[PDB]
Structures are given as structure tokens and as C-alpha cells.
């Protein structure tokens, strides 16, 4: 795949980061093993995350320098809100 995911610094323009953090615990099958991941379901191409560089349909690996891997639906959101009026969303670029 790729190494060193590039964090996209969004900036809350007095409203929101303009993107949906879809939570999805990817199970490996019938077993209890699963990874708690998240993906931007929809990013508002009107100012925030989109203009920042966040391309819709990307998988978030880290947030503000904190692995999202294992964070619950609201934990990622909080991690972002916690950052302040902005946040470094680490997404996974394309790969062969």
C-alpha cells in the first residue's frame, strides 16, 4: 500500500469541517476479530475538508496524530472537535 499518510488540515469556518466520519468495524468473518475503521462518507465541497484537500471516499488512518484505529463513532468526531477550530485528518492516498 503506502506509508506515511498525509493529514489534511481542515478549518471550521464558523460551522463545521464539512465531512462525514462513517464508523465501520470491519470484521474478518464469523470470528470476533475486527478492526474499527472510519471513512469519509461525504465531504462538503463548499469550504471545509474538501477545499482543504480531503477527497470523499478516503479512509482515515489517523487524526491530529492519533490513530483512529479502535475509536468509536463519536470518538473520532470528538478527537476532531477537541483539536479546536481545525484538525489534521490523516487519510490514505491511492496505491497500486
Amino acid at each position: 500500500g503506502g506509508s506515511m499518510r498525509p493529514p489534511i488540515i481542515i478549518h471550521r469556518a464558523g460551522k463545521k469541517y464539512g465531512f462525514t466520519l462513517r464508523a465501520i468495524r470491519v470484521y474478518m468473518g464469523d470470528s470476533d476479530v475486527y478492526t474499527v475503521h472510519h471513512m469519509v462518507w461525504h465531504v462538503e465541497d463548499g469550504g471545509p475538508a474538501s477545499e482543504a484537500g480531503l477527497r470523499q471516499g478516503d479512509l482515515i488512518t489517523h487524526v491530529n496524530g492519533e490513530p483512529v484505529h479502535g475509536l468509536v463513532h463519536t470518538e473520532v468526531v470528538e478527537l476532531i472537535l477537541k483539536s479546536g477550530n481545525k484538525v489534521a485528518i490523516s487519510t490514505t492516498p491511492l496505491e497500486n
Binding site: T20, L21, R22, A23, R25, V26, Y34, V72, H73, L81
Partner: peptide, 13 residues
């Protein structure tokens, strides 16, 4: 793969 789409709602930023 894919499960928590409803588990937690549809909270966004």
C-alpha cells in the same frame, strides 16, 4: 467488513 454503519448513527463533522 462493514457493520457499524448503523451502530452509532450517522454522526458527521
Amino acid at each position: 467488513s462493514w457493520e457499524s454503519h448503523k451502530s452509532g448513527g450517522e454522526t458527521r463533522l
